[PDB]
Structure formats: structure tokens, C-alpha cells
Amino acid sequence: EALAYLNETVIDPKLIALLDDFGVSRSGRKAISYIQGNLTSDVIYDRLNKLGADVVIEKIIKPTVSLLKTKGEALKIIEDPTNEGVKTRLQNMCKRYDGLVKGIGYDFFHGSIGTDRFAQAVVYYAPRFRKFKEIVKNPRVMDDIYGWLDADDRATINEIGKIVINATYDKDKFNNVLNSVGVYYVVRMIDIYRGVKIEHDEALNAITTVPDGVVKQDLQARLNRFKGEYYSNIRGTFKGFTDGLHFQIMTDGDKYRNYFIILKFDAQAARVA
Amino acid sequence: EEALAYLNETVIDPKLIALLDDFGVSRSGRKAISYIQGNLTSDVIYDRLNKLGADVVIEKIIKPTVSLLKTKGEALKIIEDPTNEGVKTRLQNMCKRYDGLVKGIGYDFFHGSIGTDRFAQAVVYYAPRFRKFKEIVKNPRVMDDIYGWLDADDRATINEIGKIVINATYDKDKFNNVLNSVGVYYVVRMIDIYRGVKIEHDEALNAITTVPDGVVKQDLQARLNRFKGEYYSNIRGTFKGFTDGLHFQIMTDGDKYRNYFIILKFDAQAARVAK
């Protein structure tokens, strides 16, 4: 297809057998080699076999391909010799995003996230790659964290901001944390948060659905308990960062996301009873 | 101090000022204490400084910090030079990251996780890093590489860390990619931590040599080798796991191992006296 710049693909015949059997393109095989990262041929096979080729193609390959597309399109803007000044910097960021995506890959392959999440997660980087075009136009923007972020990204950090910024903690301490950790860690946080919020909201709907009173309110206890704990972690981590206690934003996102998921299922299961 | 004149910020809390006056701390010294204070409260740094005595405070806290701030001031002059408008911002941002890291050492010190020797040892790691701006402005492309920000000492340390990490399986390019992903802020901190462990291990080495050859020398010797092993293994593991997509932080658990070596040194010395 369009993604000619790749030229790195599966060589393992067993995987090749499941990819041909699944009926995906040369384009397809390439994309899988990309997100394969340094995970073995065999383990990529092991995950994929358990799932239907049907589910696989739309949930995994399609989304990956959308990304590789927009990355090809961004790569061009680096290659352009008008952008030689900003070239190396852009390539570096490209490598960071690459690692992050391959990580979402890793996470899906070893079973930590489902197909749905994988699809949802990988698309997060599409606007980030697309952002290169805009940045080149007036380069001074790169020395800021926000210079690298689309409006969905800014929206998400502005949400986290409203969670942490308060009387005692202002826009300045917050922005300072983000400038310290860098885009790499910032976007990772963004994604992790998005996950947590999505699953929290599904648990919300599911709980509303439960017949009024009896155990319904007991569920909303857990919902509120979990939300409080998570929001607390966000504040705790940012305060701790500004205070000098630690040098890393850690929200315990994955743990809380799983908590909301279990909760959603108990709410769906209690609607029925 | 004319070198600290760019600062414009110093202790306000009057009881703290009284204690610093009781100690002989200059104006500049006040300005330094205010600097490493960060967001800690005057009560906290008062509590710490009080139990220590003017001799130690002046020599291990104030003198090193003040030297550091003089350096940071030079670096600031390079930043604000109008020639360097084009890169001004990017340097200030690094300047801020470095502030944070220093205030962190401040923090560990005030809350008792490190003592005076470590504070003075660790805080001067940053002087080269600020000085480096002077060179960086002359050839701005260097900023696009993490090694562009490292001074000679930093380079040395990284090379050494590389030798611990690089394999037939894991090569110089992979190693360099994690450095670049993580950025200078995390890279320099891993360097300080590593240096602490390395320095403590050597102290523990000497202390074991001092033990009369014999009964418990071996048992201590085992610990030294085992500990070095465990640490070096943590380093390799964290880099591999990083390029493998397993995790997104370089973490060597270095503080834990610094303490292990310090305890080991103390045990070694108590053993010299007993035997």
C-alpha cells in the first residue's frame, strides 16, 4: 500500500502461515512486524492464534495501519530539506513515539490489555504524528510541552489540571512538572488516564442501570471510593513531584482501570438479578 | 557576593534567620539555604540545621551550594546574552530541570535520607552541567543529543555504565536509544545515583581490606561481591526491559544498594576493631 518506507516484515513461516490464513496483505505482515517489536515470532503467533482472524484484522491490523500511514506522512515532513534545522529533533521524537506504540503492542501480546483497548490506544498517537506538519511552520513551539500536542491531548491534560491545580497548587507548579518529565512521560500519562476515565464512565452507566436501591447504592460506594483514590493518586504524585520527594508521575492507572472494569461487570450482572 | 546578586530570594522566616546568624551564615549563604529549601517549610530545614552545628553546615551545606549558585549565575549570563535569543528558552528549561534535581538532593538531605557528606558530594555534580552551556551555545545542534549536555565527567560515567550493559545481544545503539527516550533529566539522575553506589562500594572495599585476613573477612567479602552482582544485574535488566517494551523507566534500585554498601562498610570497620 502507501507504507513503502517500512520494508521490514515477518520471516517466520509459522506466523506467515497464520497471516496468510488470516488473509492480510504484504501491508499487513509489515505492520505486524512493526508492533512485534522485540517480542519473539512465536509469542506473536501464540496470542493471535487464540483469537479469530476476523476480530484480529479490524481490531489490530487496521488501526496499526492507520498509524503507520500518518507516520509515513510525517516522516516526509522530516525528510524535507526545508526542515533540516528541526530534522534531528523530529526524528528523536519519532523514536520515542515508536517505543511507546511498541509498548502498547507488548502489553496486548502478553495479555495485559484486550483487543478493544489496543485499537483505542494505538490511535492516540495518530494526532501526535500528524502534529509534525504544524510544528515545522513556526519551530519555536517545540521548547514547550504543549507545542507537541493536538487539542485532544491538551483537553486531556487540562482535565488532569483541574484535578490537581487548586488553592495551594497553581498552574505554574503543574506546568513545571510536565516540562520536567518531557513529552515521552506526559503522553504516556495521558493515555493511561484516558483508559481509566473510559472504564470509569462505563461503570457509571452500568450502575445507573441497576434497579434503584437495594445493592445499587452499595456499588456506587465502590465507584466513588475508587474515583477518590485515583484522583488522590494524581494529586499525591504531582505534589510529591513539586516537593522533591520523587521524580516520576505515577498514578497507578492500570490498577484502577481494572478496578472500574470489574465494577462495570458486577453492575451489569446485578442489573440482571 | 556579587556572584549571587542575580538571586533576589532568601530566607524570610525570622527564627531561621536567627539561627543562621548564630552560625555566621553570610547573605549569600542565606540565599543558598533558601534555594535548596525548595517547597519544604522553614520548620523542616530549621529542625535539620539545628541538630548539626555551624562548622558542618557552613562547610558541607552552604559552601558547596554557594559555589553551585555562582556557576548557575555564569550560566545565566550565557542564557541572557542577546546572541543566544534563538536558544534562550531551551536552556532555561534545562536550567529548571536541573533546579528540580538539586532541590531533590536538598529534600533527601533535609528529611534525613542522606547526610552532609552525600549532600556536598552530590550537589557539585551539577556545576559542570551548568558550565556546559557556555560551550553549548557555540554549537546548538549538540542539544539534539543527550551526550551534547553531558560534561567529561558525565561522559566517563555513561561510558562505564554502558560497559556494564552492552553485550553481544544488547549493543551501543540500543543503549543509546533508551537514553534518548528518557531524556537528559532522567539520564543525569541515573548518573548521580550510580556514582553514589560506586563510591560507597569502594569504601566498603577498603574497609574489608583493613579487616585482618581470616575468620569473617570472607563472609563480608561474599556480601561485597554479591551486592555488586545484584546491582549490575539490576542495570542490565532495566535497560533490556526498556528496549523490550516491558517498562518505561530506567530504574537500578541504586539508593537501596548505596545503603547496603554503607552498612557493609560499618560492619567491616566494627569487625577490624573486634579482631
Author numbering:
A (entry chain B): 163 to 435
B (entry chain A): 162 to 436
Manuscript excerpt for this entry:
One of the proteins identified in these studies was classified as BTA121. BTA121 is a completely helical protein separated into an N-terminal and a C-terminal helical bundle.
A total of 548 amino acid residues and 13 sulfate ions have ordered electron density  forming  a dimer. The monomer can also be viewed as having four helical domains (D1, 164–214; D2, 215–299; D3, 300–344; and D4, 345–435). Domains D1 and D2 are in the N-terminal bundle while D3 and D4 are in the C-terminal bundle. BTA121 has a network of interconnected tunnels connecting the large cavities some of which contain sulfate ions from the crystallization solution. The channels and tunnels connect all the cavities containing sulfate ions. The presence of such an extensive network of tunnels and cavities suggests that BTA121 may bind small molecular weight ligands, including lipids.
